[PDB]
Enzyme design. Structure first.
Site, mmCIF file in Angstrom:
data_model
loop_
_atom_site.group_PDB
_atom_site.id
_atom_site.type_symbol
_atom_site.label_atom_id
_atom_site.label_comp_id
_atom_site.label_asym_id
_atom_site.label_seq_id
_atom_site.Cartn_x
_atom_site.Cartn_y
_atom_site.Cartn_z
ATOM 1 C CB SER A 229 -0.918 0.006 1.238
ATOM 2 O OG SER A 229 -1.712 1.201 1.258
ATOM 3 C CG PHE A 316 -8.532 8.666 0.592
ATOM 4 C CD1 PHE A 316 -7.387 8.976 -0.136
ATOM 5 C CD2 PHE A 316 -9.684 8.277 -0.093
ATOM 6 C CE1 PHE A 316 -7.375 8.851 -1.529
ATOM 7 C CE2 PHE A 316 -9.686 8.169 -1.488
ATOM 8 C CZ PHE A 316 -8.529 8.454 -2.202
#
Ligand code: HEM
Ligand code: HEM
Lengths: 362, 353
Positions: A229, A316
């Site tokens: 990630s 996010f």
């Protein structure tokens, strides 16, 4: 029918057309589900059957080993230019929780037989098998894993210049439906349409002894999961660089430290939080986690519950509308036992899959 | 382990869970149990609304009148009383009654002492606002979750008893899996929340029709038995995070699909507070409620704060009930309420859909 901006069931699927089948394990969102921000996935046709992800590392303890370590990393990279070398690679650095420095070259191959030919080719095998690796005083490792097309998923918050395994795929999807909710990662694995991807078996030493250095080989087990990630802020404007460096990274760092130092309690065999470097060892503005997990389930449980990931998850969602150049993505894979090779030379006993491996006689 | 879904409601599945059958939750939770006699319940929220302090005596008398109506034949099996001040500054007394079947509530509503009161011209001249928000989920269309194993509040009070520890909790998506209908049905919302009589902007009597698979959550907090140290944890650590989330949904409902959000405190018959509260939230779809709980920073802050302080808890009672309904199984009626009250805020007029 399908509008200018498709929504619900009219949106593209994360699962490549040739891998689709009727789901016996069904999704957790209704047909109308439409995500609030766009994400894309790597696309490849049926010619991509099984990829190889090879993480090739060089480990050292002391400052005076840095020149030899960089030389070794450069030799690994040079080996990539040979026939059957990987189609893409990148270079990273991190210091582990025992204070050792680790340079890792990750290579991606579009085909298993190609990687096997490369690894068995004289220039490559002679280097890996050489007594020079023992006299070098450096640690080396190869953590090489090969998921079938149905056994990995990707998710990008951008469309161009895909890093990691995306770089060896054919191209990029349109905006996909199966994201934006817990459980979506699993749904993105094509094999999830019919299979629970449950772990079985145990990490086992099959040659050597983790405790004493030298050469050590660990066999993986069914449905170990690997997450990469990543974060890329290299070309971002000042305000997005601050969003990452000041608002995201301190919390992300806390979470990575947690997995690094509490692995056995949560089912994380190995957690590395690494910074990209150039061929000279100097830092670039990209980073990623490399996380090996005892099961996909345990990765799911951590991601949806730990305060660190929940905080950054939520950040996010907030900045998603305005994001312009900050690049975030992940790739997650599972593998059969036979499709994993973890080899170590003179690494400390906490390195990678050495730490939790069941010794040659339990 | 035991399943949240009652034995008689288990069926051949066409839709699966998001966890394998070997899943084990990390902490115990329990659910309400009822046998095949409980087919469809009725949750009737009956409100009295007022703006000015001089209306309090009339408002309290109205509440007492409603409660006395609950004592008549075919009245509800269980009820509780609450107060809150909404974001327009109006005070709202709400009496919620729970019935174990649809026909009894219908008999009750049409019975002369009840119908005559609700249909009276006096309701228009009292100066008070009145409402009825009455919804009726079938047994397969609601789920419960209790962090305790005794004296169930809300809909649990009309079920038969409490389960043992259940499997289907402790991961996002577990709420959906506790609905027995999730074995075969997505509970997808369709249709519109619609004004069918009157005009909210003008007042008087207004009637709003619901749509398929509106969701209603009652999520509750009971600290009445907590001793001093635990009271501090709840009021000083947990409640501020809860308050933040409730303010958010109250004031940003359209953005997330919440038609109405009320954060209410229980009261006794005199109107004096008890140490219990709950949210009453009506949502445009079950999945919008899921998205908020699992990805909005407000509920995630509530969640993480709870686990941070949980080791010091013991007497605090936390639970929820969530229901979905067919369009026909919902009734929302208002008399002289302000235009932001309940389903009046977001309902569309006949020419707007
Ligand atoms: C900059 C750092 C990160 C941010 C902002 C972030 C944010 C998010 C977001 C927004 C999602 C949902 C994606 C979607 O479906 O649209 C997600 C999923 C996920 N993330 Fe992260 N993440 C970060 C780093 C990491 C790391 C280092 C890990 C390693 C454990 C991780 C593990 C997961 C997992 C397992 C999921 C899938 C959840 C699911 O669909 O069930 N994340 N993340
Ligand atoms: C102090 C109050 C609250 C606390 C401590 C809290 C905590 C939690 C916890 C720990 C869970 C997971 C339960 C489990 O599966 O074991 C949960 C689920 C949930 N909560 Fe809350 N909560 C609170 C209030 C609320 C309120 C007022 C709402 C109203 C919208 C809400 C909506 C939800 C929903 C919809 C779920 C189900 C998520 C799912 O399983 O998919 N919560 N809450």
């Amino acid at each position: 029918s399908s509008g200018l901006v498709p929504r619900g069931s009219h949106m593209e699927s994360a699962i490549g057309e040739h891998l689709q089948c009727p789901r016996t394990l069904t999704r957790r969102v209704p047909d109308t589900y439409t995500p609030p921000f766009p994400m894309w996935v790597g696309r490849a046709d049926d010619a991509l059957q099984q990829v190889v992800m090879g993480y090739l590392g060089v480990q050292f303890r002391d400052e005076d080993q840095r020149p030899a370590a960089l030389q070794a990393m450069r030799d690994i990279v040079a080996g990539f230019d040979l026939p059957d070398g990987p189609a893409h690679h990148d270079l990273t650095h991190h210091i582990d929780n025992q204070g050792y420095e680790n340079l890792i070259v990750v290579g991606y191959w579009k085909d298993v037989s190609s990687q096997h030919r490369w690894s068995t080719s004289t220039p490559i095998a002679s280097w890996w098998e050489s007594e020079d690796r023992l006299s070098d005083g450096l640690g080396f490792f190869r953590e090489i894993v090969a998921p079938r097309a149905e056994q990995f998923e990707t998710l990008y918050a951008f469309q161009e210049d895909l890093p990691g395994v995306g770089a060896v795929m054919d191209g990029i999807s349109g905006e996909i439906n199966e994201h934006g909710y817990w459980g979506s990662m699993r749904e993105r694995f094509p094999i999830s349409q019919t299979d629970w991807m449950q772990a079985s078996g145990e990490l086992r030493v099959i040659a050597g002894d983790p405790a004493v250095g030298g050469r050590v080989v660990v066999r993986g087990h069914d449905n170990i999961a690997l997450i990469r990630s990543g974060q890329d802020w290299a070309d971002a404007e000042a305000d997005e660089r601050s969003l990452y460096l000041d608002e995201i990274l301190p919390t992300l760092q806390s979470g990575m430290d947690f997995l690094r130092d509490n692995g056995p309690a949560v089912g994380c065999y190995s957690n590395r939080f690494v910074r990209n470097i150039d061929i000279d060892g100097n830092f670039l503005d990209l980073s990623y986690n490399i996380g090996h997990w005892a099961s996909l389930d345990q990765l799911e449980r951590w991601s949806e519950s730990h305060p660190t990931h929940l905080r950054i998850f939520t950040t996010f969602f907030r900045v998603a509308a305005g994001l312009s150049k900050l690049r975030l993505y992940h790739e997650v894979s599972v593998f059969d036992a036979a499709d994993q090779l973890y080899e170590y030379i003179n690494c400390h006993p906490g390195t990678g899959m050495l730490r939790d491996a069941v010794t040659i006689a339990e």
